[PDB]
């Protein structure tokens, strides 16, 4: 005998509501029933002998999860620690960077940055008083990989032309909205060519795609284990190479491990073990999830290849149903993850305060589609979220990009092709309802 087959037969191993269809695993993730049992096993041990377990078994269990995730990512264990989530990790980097005294440091970032990380940038500048500022790089999707590379090299060239210093850049592994594989290998590589700190936001990363940490060699990398590695909610892996760990002077929040102003566990690794009393049972389950995905399922590569294959083929099915298309570039490099974006068969029309000149391909593509007006776009956007939840018992996040709604579907090992055919209707049935102005 061997690993379990994928598809709806795998739902027996999970704890989803059978009447609910989880097309949006990429937002909060979920865990199999066995990992939920492990999580409550750590809860039980924590309340049986609180002080003996929380004081001296927390470092032991953390080190077991650190060695389990480090071998998966194929990095030295001394380079990985656990934090609350991707939002927490990104702040740990941005709040710790000592900016140059001359006030020219600039944070380069793309306009598809996760909203929380973007607002973390906005405030870091407010709190740090304008010693640093930010330059947003507008990306146009579907985006060819070389055009993204070109726009980032153009932002550096422009930054220096205004006498400023591109200091740090945040880079997605897989972007949130739209759910798209980002060419982070090239942008990270040029960050070192131009001596720019690479802060890799890879929240949509571990468990879904190969992060290639040893090869890309980033200065910092964040990734949510609870998103695609079946780790309980509230866990991210924080990778820092030893050359740059001295820059993480304080954790978030500051705790006992901080040092103001031999030869065992490093002070960096020690500082992340106790950062305030929390439930660490999700951190403990990381070694269980990696074990379960390997022993019960085929392993990481068999998991990832199925999801990506299902994301392309299934995204293509809902695209052929709706009569639109998938979000993809000419190199086929955007759908290199478990998520896929499909355009909905209508448009919202020009907004006068912010007009959009679409390319010929985009205008040509919309010919014949039904058009609602722009005042009702936000109203229709909220109406589709409730109806999907209330009538259809599902959730589908949608990206509003250039007068098109792009639905983001996320494939997973407990899903199959019939789950997209169902997604085809619901989106098409519901899109037939917005054309009839039902949201009013």
Ligand X SMILES: C[N+](C)(C)[C@@H](Cc1c[nH]c(SO)n1)C(=O)O
- The reply on whether position 253 binds ligand X by CB under 6 A is no
Min CB(364)–ligand X separation in Å: 32
Integer Cα distance of 266 and 269 in angstroms? 5
Radius of gyration of the chain (CA): 23
**118-123 contacts at long range (C-beta below 8 A, 24 or more positions apart):** 120/87, 120/90, 120/91, 120/94, 121/94, 121/170
CB within 8 Å of 106: residues ≥ 6 apart: 132, 133, 134, 135, 159, 164, 165, 166, 167
Rounded to a whole number of angstroms, the minimum distance from the CB of residue 55 to ligand X is 4
Strands 197-201 and 220-224: parallel
CB of 124 to its own copies, least distance (A): 8
* Gap between the Cα atoms of 43 and 19, Å rounded: 29
Does 49 bind ligand X (CB under 6 A)? Our answer is no
- CB contact set of 12 (below 8 Å; sequence gap of 6+): none
Give the x-and-dash track for 213-252 against ligand X (CB under 6 A). ----------------------------------------
Whether 129 has a binding-site annotation, put simply, is no
Separation between Cα atoms, residue 65 and residue 191, nearest integer Å: 31
Does 9 appear as a known binding residue? no
Q: Is 382 in the site for ligand X (CB under 6 A)?
A: no
3-state secondary structure 75-142: CCHHHEEEECCHHHHHHHHHCCCCCCCCCCEEEEEECCCCHHHHHHHHHHHHHCCCCCEEEEECCCCC
Decide whether 59 or 349 has the Cβ nearer to ligand X.
Answer: 59
Task: Give the whole-angstrom CA distance, residue 192 versus residue 36.
Answer: 41
Among 230, 238, 274, 414, binds ligand X (CB under 6 A): 274
Q: What are phi and psi of 32, to 5 degrees?
A: -70, 160
- The distance of closest approach from Cβ of residue 246 to ligand X in the complex, given in angstroms and rounded to an integer, is 22
Residue among 95 and 192 whose Cβ is closer to its own copies: 95
Q: Where are the alpha helices (DSSP H) in 128-183?
A: 145-161
Q: Is there binding between residue 52 and its own copies (CB under 8 A)?
A: yes
> Could you tell me which stretch among 124-132, 163-171, 172-180, 340-348 binds its own copies (CB under 8 A)?
124-132
Member of 1, 264, 277, 330 binding ligand X (CB under 6 A):
277
d(CA 91, CA 72): 25
The window from 111-119, 151-159, 179-187, 213-221 that contacts its own copies (CB under 8 A) reads: 111-119
- Residue 394 near residue 388 (C-beta atoms within 8 A): yes
Which residue, 264 or 277, has its beta carbon nearer to ligand X? 277
Binding track over 91-110 against its own copies, x by CB under 8 A = x---x---------------
Binding site for ligand X (CB under 6 A): 27, 55, 256, 274, 277
Binding site for its own copies (CB under 8 A): 14-17, 20, 22, 24, 27-31, 36, 39-40, 43-44, 46-52, 54-55, 84-88, 90-91, 95, 115-116, 119-120, 122-127, 224, 226, 232-234, 249-250, 252-256, 258, 260-261, 275-279, 282, 389, 393, 395
Residue ranges for the binding site?
A: 27, 408
């Amino acid at each position: 005998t061997g690993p379990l087959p994928f598809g709806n037969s795998l739902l027996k191993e999970f704890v989803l509501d059978p009447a609910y269809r989880n097309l949006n695993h990429g937002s909060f993730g979920t865990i199999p029933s066995a990992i939920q049992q492990k999580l409550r096993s750590y809860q039980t041990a924590a309340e049986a002998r609180p002080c003996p377990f929380l004081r001296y078994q927390t470092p032991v269990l953390l080190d077991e999860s650190r060695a389990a995730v480090a071998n998966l990512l194929k990095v030295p264990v001394e380079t990985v620690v656990f934090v609350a989530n991707a939002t927490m990790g990104v702040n740990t980097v941005l709040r710790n960077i000592v900016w140059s005294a001359d006030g020219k440091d600039e944070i380069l970032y793309f306009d598809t940055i996760f909203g929380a990380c973007g607002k973390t940038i906005d405030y870091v500048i407010e709190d740090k008083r304008g010693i640093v500022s930010s330059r947003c790089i507008p990306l146009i999707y579907p985006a060819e990989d070389d055009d993204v590379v070109a726009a980032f090299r153009d932002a550096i060239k422009k930054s220096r032309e205004e006498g400023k210093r591109p200091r740090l850049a945040v880079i997605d592994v897989v972007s949130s909205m739209p759910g798209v594989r980002f060419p982070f290998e090239d942008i990270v590589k040029i960050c070192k060519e131009e001596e720019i700190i690479s802060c890799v936001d890879g929240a949509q990363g571990i468990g879904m795609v190969d992060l290639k940490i040893t090869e890309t060699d980033p200065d910092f990398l964040i990734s949510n284990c609870h998103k695609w590695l079946f780790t309980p909610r509230g866990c991210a892996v924080f990778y820092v190479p030893v050359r740059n760990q001295h820059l993480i002077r304080s954790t978030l929040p500051t705790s006992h491990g901080f040092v103001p102003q031999a030869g065992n566990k490093s002070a960096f690794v020690s500082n992340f073990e106790f950062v305030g009393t929390v439930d660490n049972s999700p951190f403990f389950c990381v070694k269980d999830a990696i074990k379960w995905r390997e022993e019960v399922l085929g392993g990481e590569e068999r998991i990832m290849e199925y999801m990506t294959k299902l994301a392309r083929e299934g995204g293509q099915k809902v695209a052929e149903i709706l009569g639109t298309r998938v979000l993809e570039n000419s190199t086929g490099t955007l759908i290199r993850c478990a998520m896929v974006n499909i355009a909905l068969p209508f448009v919202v029309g020009e907004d006068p305060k912010a007009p959009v000149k679409l390319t010929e391909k985009e205008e040509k593509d919309v010919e014949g589609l039904y058009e609602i007006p722009h005042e009702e776009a936000n109203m229709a956007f909220k109406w589709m979220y409730n109806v999907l939840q209330d009538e259809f018992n599902t959730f589908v996040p949608m990206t509003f990009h250039r007068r098109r709604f792009w639905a983001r579907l996320s494939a997973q090992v407990y899903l199959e092709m019939s789950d997209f055919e169902w997604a085809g209707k619901t989106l098409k049935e519901l899109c037939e309802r917005v054309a009839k102005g039902e949201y009013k």
